[PDB]
Design a protein around this ligand. Structure first.
Ligand SMILES: Nc1ncnc2c1ncn2[C@@H]1O[C@H](COP(=O)(O)OP(=O)(O)O)[C@@H](O)[C@H]1O
Ligand SMILES: Nc1ncnc2c1ncn2[C@@H]1O[C@H](COP(=O)(O)OP(=O)(O)O)[C@@H](O)[C@H]1O
Lengths: 574, 100
């Protein structure tokens, strides 16, 4: 009473479990016991493991195979062979009338002449598709009569959304299968997982693994990788480190630096950001800021103090890290401070989720923010801000021109400031926990000694919008008077950037501070913001490159100095 | 113990991972992309020997850089270094037939 075909096309977990070739199974005791409890029934023994990819469903199947041989089952499963199978391997051919149904009939005929096979199907949400879609002899329409009478015994393994989508075929498929929810393990659970089988990858790679190594593996896989679960991520980082260390040994100990190195190579943040700033990024974040940001030093030290206060603090993790509103004119540095801190908080930022609330002018415009109802226009994706954060829920949100919101949105804002994690989507609850909500404010420029401006702007907020609203917001970062010498300073910074760019193109330009001063005076007016300066320096540099390359007056490789010696830009190339 | 290597495209790799059930766990992606328009020059300069031997001609390196610079620009149908290698071989046969 043996099974030729089923053994030919389905791996026998029991057989390779005899040989101790199977890796250990750690934890999951409650889940495996529940699996056995379901398998012990008489009519529908089939459990369907519902979780997320990479959580350890197949690990639970392996553990069950283990406990079978290791005399752990309650003698109703004693000597029963677990066989993993995949329908994809079964089908293998569709251009012919009945080949597939023939394979599956053979398989059923072997399950008959046996009692010890419990066929573990991975991703049985694909058990309904084969052959005709929903009106012909698919796989399910021939499994169901056997499944309902205990003829066949099974262990399915789906994903939650696949269960929800492909148990709309309820009638048979649901009642034939009992769900067993398996959830992804926590940090500590996963650390113990790893400590279970460190002596497997150690023996495979002949490399030594430390405990802080796997701690960093788990912490890193959580912080810097998403769209992948545990213990998958962890064991994968560990094994990648094992292989890479083995190679480096040729042309014997994995440590946290290697874990950082593999995570960096995966996601793209540099290694210096991951490892060394792990608890000192807040220690030098003010240095990072005052490097990237020039001016408004009082504002930047206020922000630094607030973020390190919330950072090395006991604040409720649930609600968002920082709620700051910048009062000031435009062009004073609102975005630069944001990008700088984000680059210092979430290293290598590219993360400021900017939203212009002046675009969400009116009442119904808030549906553009959250999304349309189901039976209405533009509902499928929608959710500008909601989908934006749902994508990467680890960043810094900047909301431009908070004033221009109709009062309809301030409600959503205060809900967010009420512990975040707002459910403002088509059934999606987005979480704003590690984020930082920042709001570009109104003019507020007229009020801008220190205490005077302060009381003024507080009253302007009283008159402007709710006191309760700012009672929600943490800090009021005031963007003081426009730049006077910081003008020339930011000219210098941009020109340093542009000189680097011009140098890597095999040139060298050095503009003296007199020309910098002239560009400063021209570019930005006293009333106007400091933004056109970008354009001003662009036009001057494009003119000089245009003329000098067109005229040919200059030769490549000769340093280029600009001055205002004649009252105009004079270029002395030599 | 069937450890193997796979060579497909991107979209066909998507067609593959749509079998993630039993095949995502085992396989692994390795993105392999065009050599630089600069790198291709050293590629050819390294392998220009074999063809010039085959056709009993010789290939100047300016001809190689020019072939690369016309391949990346004026053909665009295929990819590096296939473009340039094909051009090298078509020239190394045309000139041969021109001689004999
Ligand atoms: N408790 C555990 N015991 C053994 N392996 C585990 C455990 N938890 C996670 N894993 C590892 O996670 C990886 C993927 O788990 P698996 O169940 O195959 O994902 P999926 O649920 O998509 O099949 C496996 O390589 C497995 O070794
Ligand atoms: N404190 C500052 N330090 C460095 N650069 C600044 C500072 N304030 C403004 N800038 C410059 O202003 C420009 C940013 O303009 P932008 O942020 O779009 O203005 P706004 O925030 O009003 O929209 C950047 O080029 C930046 O160099």
């Amino acid at each position: 009473a043996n099974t030729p075909t089923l053994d030919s096309l389905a791996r026998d977990l029991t057989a390779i479990a005899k040989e101790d070739s199977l890796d250990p199974v750690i934890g999951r005791s409650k889940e495996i016991q529940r699996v056995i409890e379901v398998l012990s029934r008489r009519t529908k023994n089939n459990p369907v493991l519902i979780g997320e990819p990479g959580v350890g469903k197949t690990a639970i199947a392996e553990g069950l195979a283990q406990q079978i041989i290791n005399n752990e089952v309650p003698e109703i499963l004693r000597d029963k062979r677990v066989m993993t199978l995949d329908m994809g391997t079964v089908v293998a051919g569709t251009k012919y009338r009945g080949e597939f149904e023939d394979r599956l009939k053979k398989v059923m005929d072997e399950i008959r002449q046996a009692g010890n096979i419990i066929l573990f199907i991975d991703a049985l949400h694909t058990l309904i598709g084969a052959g005709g879609a929903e009106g012909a002899i698919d796989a399910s329409n021939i499994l169901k009569p056997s499944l309902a009478r205990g003829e066949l015994q099974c262990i399915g393994a789906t994903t939650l959304d696949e269960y929800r989508k492909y148990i709309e075929k309820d009638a048979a498929l649901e009642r034939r299968f009992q769900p067993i929810q398996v959830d992804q393990p926590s940090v500590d659970e996963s650390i113990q997982i790893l400590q279970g089988l460190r002596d497997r990858y150690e023996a495979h790679h002949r490399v030594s693994i430390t405990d802080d190594a796997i701690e960093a593996a788990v912490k890193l896989s959580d912080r810097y990788i998403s769209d992948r679960f545990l213990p998958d991520k962890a064991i994968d980082l560990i094994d990648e480190a094992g292989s890479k260390v083995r190679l480096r040994s040729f042309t014997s100990e994995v440590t946290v630096d290697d874990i950082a190195m593999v995570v960096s190579s995966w996601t793209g943040v540099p290694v210096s950001k991951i490892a060394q700033t792990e608890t000192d990024k807040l220690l030098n974040m003010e240095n990072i800021l005052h490097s990237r940001v020039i001016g408004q030093d009082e504002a930047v030290v206020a922000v630094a103090k607030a973020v390190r206060r919330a950072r090395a603090g006991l604040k409720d993790p649930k609600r968002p890290i920082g709620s700051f509103i910048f009062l000031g004119p435009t062009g004073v540095g609102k975005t630069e401070l944001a990008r700088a801190l984000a680059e210092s908080i979430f290293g290598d930022e590219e993360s400021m989720i900017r939203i212009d609330m002046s675009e969400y002018m009116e009442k119904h415009s808030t549906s553009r923010l959250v999304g349309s109802p189901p039976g209405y226009v533009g509902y499928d994706e929608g959710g500008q801000l909601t989908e934006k954060v749902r994508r990467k829920p680890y960043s810094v949100v900047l909301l431009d021109a908070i004033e221009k919101a109709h009062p309809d949105v301030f409600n959503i804002l205060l809900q967010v400031l009420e512990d975040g994690r707002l459910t403002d989507s088509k059934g999606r609850t987005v979480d704003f926990r590690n984020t930082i909500l920042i709001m570009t404010s109104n003019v507020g420029a007229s009020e801008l000694n220190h205490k005077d401006m302060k009381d003024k702007v507080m009253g302007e907020l009283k008159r402007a919008f709710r006191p309760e609203f700012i009672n929600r917001i943490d800090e009021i970062i005031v963007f003081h008077s426009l730049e006077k010498k910081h003008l020339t300073e930011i000219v210098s910074l941009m020109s340093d950037q542009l000189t680097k760019r011009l140098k890597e193109q095999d040139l060298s330009i050095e503009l003296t501070d007199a020309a910098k001063a002239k560009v400063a005076e021209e570019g930005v007016d006293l009333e106007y913001g400091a933004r056109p300066l970008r354009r001003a320096i662009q036009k001057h540099v494009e003119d000089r490159l245009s003329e000098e390359l067109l005229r040919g007056n200059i030769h490549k490789g000769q340093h280029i100095v600009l001055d205002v010696e004649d009252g105009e830009f004079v270029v002395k190339t030599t």
